[PDB]
């Protein structure tokens, strides 16, 4: 019923061209939305390529969102026309379970994405209010827009996993885009920040503007050593195939790796590698609706955006092509309002 | 100064034999006590022939300990002569480090083993006070002794992990010397077990003689599959290599793999079997004072003791060889009070 129009793939190539669709209507408990920028990430290449055989053509990316409310129906309370709303991956789940009574609905097996009816690299988007955040007016919308992917897929296990409080010792094992927005969280939440990366170039970088207390070169055995056992938790950001024995290593007893990468290689994980000091390893996906609320107000607090690079909607396949693997650390971010026309 | 009796192996066959020595005199803080029955384990077998290359000869077994105390030390108030006791395998720790302060000191780096001194299959026993714990009068010293191993080990993560409160759903995998003592404790918490193997011949057992509410052929894949993410948690206690993928996949989102076997292969652990749900797999090994303090009252409460072959100290090295097959059902308790002789 409502025109829409974005960029569109047509088969699993991933090269996106301008495309006219249509959405529904303003239902009774949605909210219609311009959309300002759209972030984007690795996500959004594998899906436009079919990698994982559950993509149907055409294709509509846009799974990181900020806009201005348009239309709210008539049931909506919590916005108003004009408001700056953010809208991530996860848009709808089946709300029975056990994990949409918990509110860790991000877990609900029947979890449907933003970009499974058209994502929101086009003009407009219509969505469920329960799935809508109240954008914060002191963060910008440009750099601010990846905190809904990168920032809560960070925060949601660090809440989880007790690697949020002052004086924990948190080590961040990449530095790209990802392991940066883990990095900003991990010092706002006063923690001694231990920075593992495989490479000295990294360093500088590291400890720029109060970042990093500690940088470890996880290639230089004696430094490594040095700082076994030390480390409270680590959060994994590391993309490509990597082991988990020098990480689990810099563990304390009872401390908790966390993977937020998913490598085509298996993980080797000796059984002693647990054992020796009882060690946890967990992984973790995105995070629910009230931990992305959360998220975002602390991130306003302590004043959190990522490293962007802004593009206009005609560079978005250069783009694709750019961020394939590479975990970039100025993330590609798409102004939609200024540059998508009919 | 204190003679003392035991058995020995002089080198890594692993073959005890008669052997005298002497413990210390009781100082200010000890308790004395004499050794009435001596459970042993894999650990024995293992530490006797020298497998991970710490054991020094000669050496004599016996890290789980029940006995009735024979002096204490002037400062001694918490024990009397006649007390019975028990001890587990650490009996001390440095005192100064985060897991020693915490109370968690069975993860302390520089833990003392009883068996690294000249275990307690020996007629007397010495060990400071703060490692022994009251035996409650309602718990079987026989049957009772594998608690301060088997049941430590699984109990002290089912409390750590929260797999520990009525109507969760708990997961055992193997239904061994170590399965069949969690499986017990998983029932005394109210928990809806489900046990799960890699063979029918053990369905019986598990409903008729452990009242599991659900058995799990693991080779079985239309059952496996049927079971796919309805778990909160699973203890793990194969002791030989396998796979946690079909493990992981019986898993709730957020639930939680406890591994408590040292298999000798490598763990294979494909990134995705951890993300699709937010998954955790942790190790642990025994527990902590307060632990096992905590957990032999509340086996005394629930009437929960191991199955145990009891033998005479002359049957020692046939039981020994006989754990390379796991050939028993399901520990091996020495009756030291009544058998070990001068
Ligand atoms: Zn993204
Ligand atoms: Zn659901
Ligand atoms: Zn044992
Ligand atoms: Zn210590």
Same mark, same amino acid.
Request: hydrophobic share 40%; proline share 6%; charged share 20%.
């Given at each position: 019923?409502?025109?829409?129009?974005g960029?569109?793939?047509?088969?699993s190539?991933g090269?996106?061209?301008?495309?006219?669709?249509?959405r529904?209507?303003?239902?009774?408990?949605?909210?219609?939305?311009?959309?300002?920028?759209?972030?984007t990430?690795?996500?959004d290449?594998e899906?436009?390529k079919?990698?994982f055989?559950f993509?149907?053509?055409?294709?509509?990316?846009?799974?990181?969102?900020?806009?201005?409310?348009?239309?709210?129906?008539?049931?909506?309370?919590?916005f108003?026309?004009?408001? +700056?709303?953010?809208?991530? &991956?996860?848009?709808?789940?089946?709300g029975?379970?056990?994990?949409?009574?918990?509110?860790?609905?991000?877990?609900?097996?029947?979890?449907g994405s933003i970009?499974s009816?058209?994502?929101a690299?086009?003009?407009?988007?219509?969505?469920?209010?329960?799935?809508?955040?109240?954008?914060?007016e002191?963060? @910008?919308?440009?750099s601010?827009? @990846?905190?809904?992917?990168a920032?809560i897929?960070a925060?949601? @296990?660090?809440?989880?996993?007790?690697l949020?409080?002052?004086?924990?010792?948190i080590?961040?094992?990449?530095?790209?885009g990802?392991g940066?927005?883990?990095?900003?969280?991990?010092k706002?939440?006063?923690?001694?920040?231990?920075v593992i990366?495989? &490479?000295?170039? +990294?360093?500088?970088?590291?400890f720029?503007?109060?970042?990093?207390?500690?940088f470890?070169?996880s &290639?230089?055995?004696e430094?490594?050593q040095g700082?076994?056992?030390?480390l409270?938790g680590?959060?994994?950001?590391?993309?490509?195939?990597? &082991?988990l024995? @020098?990480?689990?290593?810099?563990?304390?007893?009872l401390?908790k790796?966390?993977?937020?990468?998913?490598?085509?290689?298996?993980?080797?994980?000796?059984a002693?590698?647990?054992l020796?000091?009882?060690k946890?390893?967990?992984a973790?996906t995105?995070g629910?609706?009230?931990?992305?609320?959360?998220?975002?107000?602390?991130?306003?607090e302590?004043?959190i955006?990522?490293?962007?690079?802004?593009?206009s909607?005609?560079?978005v396949?250069?783009?694709?092509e750019?961020?394939?693997?590479?975990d970039?650390?100025?993330?590609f971010?798409?102004?939609?309002?200024?540059?998508?026309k009919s």
């Open positions: 019923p409502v025109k829409a129009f960029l569109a793939a047509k088969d190539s090269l996106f061209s301008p495309f006219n669709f249509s529904r209507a303003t239902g009774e408990h949605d909210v219609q939305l311009k959309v300002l920028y759209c972030g990430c690795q996500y290449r899906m436009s079919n990698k055989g993509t149907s053509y055409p294709y509509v990316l846009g799974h990181e969102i900020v806009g201005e409310v348009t239309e709210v129906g008539s049931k909506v309370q919590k108003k026309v004009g408001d +700056k709303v953010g809208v991530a &991956s996860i848009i709808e789940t089946c029975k379970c056990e994990m949409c009574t918990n509110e860790v609905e991000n877990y609900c097996p029947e979890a970009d009816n058209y994502g690299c086009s003009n407009i988007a219509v969505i469920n209010e329960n799935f809508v955040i109240r954008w914060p002191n963060l @910008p919308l440009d601010g827009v @990846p905190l809904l992917c920032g897929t925060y949601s @296990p660090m809440k989880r996993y007790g949020d409080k002052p004086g924990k010792r080590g961040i094992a990449g530095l790209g990802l940066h927005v883990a990095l900003r969280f991990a706002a939440f006063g923690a001694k920040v231990t990366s495989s &490479s000295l170039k +990294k360093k500088r970088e590291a720029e503007k109060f970042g990093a207390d500690s470890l070169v &290639s230089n055995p430094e490594m700082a076994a056992g030390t409270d680590i959060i994994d950001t590391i993309p490509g195939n990597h &082991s024995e @020098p990480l689990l290593a810099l563990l304390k007893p401390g790796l966390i993977i937020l990468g998913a490598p085509e290689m298996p993980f080797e994980v000796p002693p590698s647990l020796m000091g009882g946890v390893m967990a973790s995105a629910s609706m009230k931990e992305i609320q959360e998220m975002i107000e602390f991130a306003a302590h004043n955006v990522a490293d962007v690079e802004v593009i909607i005609d560079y396949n250069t783009a694709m750019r961020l394939d693997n590479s970039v650390r100025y993330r971010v798409i102004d939609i309002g200024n540059t998508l």
